[PDB]
Structure formats: C-alpha cells, structure tokens
C-alpha cells in the first residue's frame, strides 16, 4: 500500500468521467489539440504561411476557417515554441504556423491516450479489447495522412490544414496531383466506408423489423430490458427474409458483429497504405498501355484520358495560389483550356 | 466514368461546399464509425462459450433463444469510455439509431 | 468515347457511356433507330440499361 | 519418444470458402488492370 | 494494347495460389465429418 498503489486507486475510481492512468496522457493532449484548433480558427491568420485569411476574426465563416500548415520554408520543423524558429515569441509562433504542429502532435498523443483508455477500461471491466483494436483504424489514417504524408514531401506545408474548406482543398489536390481516385487502396477504403454505412443501416433496420412483440404499446422501444436473457428480435425470421430477398443471409450473430468490425476497419487500413505511397508521389496515376495507344491514335478516348485532362486543369489553375512559395507565374497563354471556357 | 461525373459535378456545382453533401459524408463516415463501434462492442462482450482452439463464432447457434453477448457489460465499458449517459442500454433504440443515421445522411446526399 | 473492354479498356477505365447530348432527354429505344449501328453510336444501351435498372 | 501432443486439426467451413474465394476473385478483378497496366 | 506481359501470370497466380489453399482446407474439413 504505497503511493503508487494509492494513486492507482484514485485514478481508477468510478466517477462520472473515468480518469485512469491513460487519462494522464489523454486529457491534457486532447484538450490542447482542441483548444489549439478553436483558438486558431477564432483568432489566427494564415497570411504569412499561406497568404490566406483563416479565422473568424478575419471574416471567415465556419466552413473557411482553418488552422493552416506552416510555411513550406519550415520544412518538417517541429516548430517548438522554444525552438529556433519562434525563439519563444508566442506571437511569431502563431504567425509561423506553430499551432499546426501543436495540434498535430498533441493530437497524436491524445489518440494514443484514447486507445490506452480503451485498453484500460476494458481490462478493468473484464471485456475483450476489440473496441481498442478497431480504433487502430482511425489512428492509421491520422498518422499516415497528417504525419507520414507530409514527412515524405517537402514540408508540413502539404499536409491537410485543420479546417472544412481546407480539407476540401486537400481532396481536390489529391485528385489533380496524385489521381488518388484511380488508386486501388483508396478504392478499398471507399468500399470499407460505404460497406460500413450499408452494414450499419441494414443491421439496424433488420433488428427493428424482426422484433418480437414483447410489449402492448405501439412504441416498441419500451419492451426491451437490458438484463433480459432473450434475443429481442428473431434471427430466424431475419435469416429467412434475407435469404429470400437477396439469396444469402447471416445465420451467426457473432460472425455478423465481427464482420461489422472487420469491414470499416480494414477499409481504413487499406486507404492508409495508399496515402503512405503518396507520401513518395508513388501514385496510381496512369495506365501505361492507355497512354501509348492514345499518343499514337488521336481518336482513342476513354474516361481515363478525360479525367487526366481535368487533373491537368486543376494543377495549372490552382498551383500558383496553392503553393505561393514556388512563385509560379503562368501567363494566360500557357493555361490549359478547352474551347470557349 | 464515375470519377469523371464527380469531378465535373464539383466544377459546376461546388458540391463539397453544399450542406447536403456534407450531411452525406456525416452519414457515411458516421455509418462506418457506428458499424465499427457496434461490431466491436458486441464482439467485445461475447460470453465465453468456446475454447482458445475454436472460433468464438461457434458459441452462437442459429435460432438459440438467449442473447450471445452481455449488453450490460458493453454498456458498462462504453459508458465509462465516454460517460454513462452517452451510451445505450436499450438494444432497440441502439439498433434504430444504427439504422437512422446512415439512412438520413444518404437521403440528404441524394437530395443534394 | 470508347468504353468497352474489346475497344481498349480495362476494368477500371471501361464504362457503358451515356447517350448523346444530341438526344437530350428524348426517349431512344432500339426501334427509334435506323439500325443497331446507329443506336450503338449514339449510346442507346445506356438508356435501355438505366431505365430497366431503375424500374427493377 | 512420444508423438507430438500439440497437433490440432484445421477447419474451413463452406461459408468461409465462399467468402475467401469471393475475396480473392474480387481482389484479382480489382488489381488485374494494374498488373497489366 | 501494349500491356505488361507478366500481368497474365501474375493474375493467374494471384488467383490460383490462395484459392487452391482455401479448397485444400475445405475438402479435408468435409472428409472429417
């Protein structure tokens, strides 16, 4: 019964918000990532890193406000407050993009803290730790996208900035420069997310329409008791229904709920891998066979060659404002354009 | 061709900046999240019916009348992961929430 | 625009191409075409497919 | 010397086989275009 | 089309090797029960 054990006691008390040992990492870091994002979006500009306004103070609304990435010139600098870039000056630190590293790193340690909490609470309660395991998928996306991707690039400048329209911009960048929609790892992600949403909706709907009549009321919610031993819907009728509508159905509730874990988690992991490739401009940009034929045969046209024309438009039209440090000057006559437009 | 359609749609309609598309993403991302959540929570709270050398799935037999996981145990873990009252203890309300969130998000993105 | 596998597409790039802007919203069944060759050039299959699919 | 006591039989039920084949066939269908390039 | 020749053998094997593996485990499961 020493101090360590006394603190364990106190951390693990059953209270409205459980603390745990993981709370020591989670809570400060989660609160600081979120404070940094609300602080930056309210007050802080992107003028010096990006030539953009990005805060409510400047006239931005909820969609356009962002905590923007540091200037490309900062490389992959940690941009510590006390570091040689900002030399302790909090004002300069904001103006140089320090809040982006602040948010990203405190955010990274918070996700760790959060998944530690999932492990901690599951051990204390005596459940298997599959919810923690599932949470590995959001971690993978976060690190690959916000950390790995810009680390393979020239700077943090090219990571996503923390904001609604700034993320939209990130999406469009990845189409035009990486042709990310063509990437089978994104496609596997798409099918995991869409497959997830489908499973979510189809499983909720099935339970609600194979219910057992357990209460007298038109409102079927009242007739469930959290401690009842009985399944509250018929798996048998659900199974016959889906077998006759769709041909196959689930017959094993355990497989079903595992598959629900499996689909979206795997989807996310696959997309993380592909972003890791893009860290290196290692893209699924082209099909070589298509380019060779099309170079030689100017009547050959597919949706594949149509979409690269659009990526070419995107790059040339957005690059100068989206990468100001490159001092891209594209005179009117070099801009790719179709007829009339 | 799909990608072509969605790139042109964005040029001509700025769909990313359209609230109904944003609700679609909310409905699709949330759908995937809650699929994972519900799957991981039911999976987390399976009742030991098997040995380490067999699939846990064999702990459920088709049409058995007892439930095959402990929802109070799942509630107790998830309520403590967040706080008590952000966690479901009624399986009907939970599965209706599961159904409604993606359905409505996609209604909206279809309406977008 | 070439959409099919035998015309130089793969699974990722192939498509049944939408019907001609020249047709607009006009109904274009096979029997409104002079011939299948015309119907294929102007993208008749798309309409046949989407109308049957949406009904079905 | 005794025969090893740690040995165990392996199982793959029919549903798992249908699922695994579908996974592989669909994976092949997705990547084949990239393999040919 | 000027397509990578090894795509064929790669697709074939990518398909055949994991499938044969599955079949092997299935048929020997059925012969137990």
């Amino acid at each position: 019964r020493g101090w360590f054990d006394i603190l364990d006691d106190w951390l693990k008390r059953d209270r409205f918000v459980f603390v745990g040992w993981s709370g020591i990492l989670l809570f400060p870091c989660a609160y600081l990532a979120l404070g940094g994002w609300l602080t930056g979006t309210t007050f802080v500009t992107s003028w010096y890193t990006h030539g953009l306004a990005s805060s409510y103070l400047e006239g931005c609304n909820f969609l356009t406000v962002a905590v923007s990435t540091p200037a490309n010139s900062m490389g992959h600098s940690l941009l510590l407050l006390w570091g040689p870039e900002a030399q302790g000056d909090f004002t300069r630190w904001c103006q140089l993009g320090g809040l982006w590293t602040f948010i990203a790193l405190h955010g990274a340690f918070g996700l760790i803290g959060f998944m530690l909490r999932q492990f901690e609470i599951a051990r204390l309660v005596g459940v298997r730790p599959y919810n923690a395991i599932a949470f590995s998928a959001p971690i993978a996306v976060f690190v690959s996208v916000f950390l790995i991707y810009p680390l393979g690039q020239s700077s943090w400048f090219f990571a996503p900035s923390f904001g609604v329209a700034a993320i939209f911009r990130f999406l469009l960048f990845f189409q035009g420069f990486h042709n990310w929609t063509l990437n089978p790892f994104h496609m596997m992600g798409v099918a995991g997310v869409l497959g997830g949403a489908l499973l979510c909706a189809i499983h909720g709907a099935t339970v609600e329409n194979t219910l057992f009549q357990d209460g007298e009321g038109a409102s079927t919610f009242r007739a469930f008791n959290p401690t009842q031993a009985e399944e509250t819907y018929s798996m048998v009728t659900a199974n016959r229904f889906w077998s006759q509508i769709f041909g196959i159905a689930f017959s094993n509730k355990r497989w079903l709920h595992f598959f629900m874990l499996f689909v979206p988690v795997t989807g996310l992991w696959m997309s993380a891998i592909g972003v890791v490739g893009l860290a290196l401009n290692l893209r699924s940009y082209d099909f070589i066979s298509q380019e060779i034929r099309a170079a030689e045969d100017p009547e050959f046209e597919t949706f594949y060659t149509k979409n690269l024309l659009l990526n070419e438009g995107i790059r040339a039209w957005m690059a100068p404002q989206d990468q100001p440090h490159e001092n891209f000057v594209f005179p009117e006559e070099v801009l790719p354009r179709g007829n009339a437009l | 061709g799909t990608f072509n359609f969605m790139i042109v749609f964005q040029a001509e309609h700025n769909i990313l900046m359209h609230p109904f598309h944003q609700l679609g993403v909310a409905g699709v991302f949330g759908g995937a999240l809650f699929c994972a959540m519900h799957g991981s929570l039911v999976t987390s709270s399976l009742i030991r019916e098997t040995t380490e050398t067999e699939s846990a799935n064999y702990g459920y037999k088709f049409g058995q009348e007892e439930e095959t996981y402990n929802i109070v145990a799942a509630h107790g873990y998830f309520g403590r992961l967040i706080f008590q009252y952000a966690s479901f203890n009624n399986s009907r309300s939970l599965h209706f929430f599961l159904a409604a969130w993606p359905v409505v998000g996609v209604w909206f993105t279809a309406l977008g | 625009v070439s959409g099919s596998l035998l015309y130089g597409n793969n699974i990722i790039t192939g498509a049944v191409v939408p019907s001609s802007n020249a047709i607009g919203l006009h109904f274009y069944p096979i029997w409104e075409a002079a011939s299948l060759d015309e119907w294929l050039y102007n993208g008749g299959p798309y309409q046949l497919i989407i109308f049957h699919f949406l009904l079905g | 010397m005794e025969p090893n006591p740690n040995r165990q039989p392996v199982e793959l039920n029919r549903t798992s086989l249908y699922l695994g084949l579908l996974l592989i066939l669909v994976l092949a269908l997705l990547f084949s275009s990239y393999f040919f390039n | 089309m000027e397509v990578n020749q090894l795509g064929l053998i790669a697709t074939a094997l990518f398909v055949l090797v994991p499938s044969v593996f599955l079949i092997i485990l299935y048929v020997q499961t059925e012969s137990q029960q």
Partner: peptide, 30 residues
C-alpha cells in the same frame, strides 16, 4: 489476353454466386 482474363474472373464470380446461393450450408435451428 487481358480481355479474356477480366471476363474469366467475372464469370468465376457469377458461378461462385450460383453456388453460394443454391449450395450453401443450409442454416439449421438450435
């Protein structure tokens, strides 16, 4: 040759579908 490969794989999936539906382990109650 690529055409053949694509259509072959697709055909296998359709056949798999056939077996998965009409030749499933039939579900048996309790």
């Amino acid at each position: 040759m690529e055409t053949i490969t694509y259509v072959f794989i697709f055909a296998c999936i359709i056949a798999l579908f056939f077996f998965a539906i009409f030749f499933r382990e039939p579900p048996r109650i309790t």
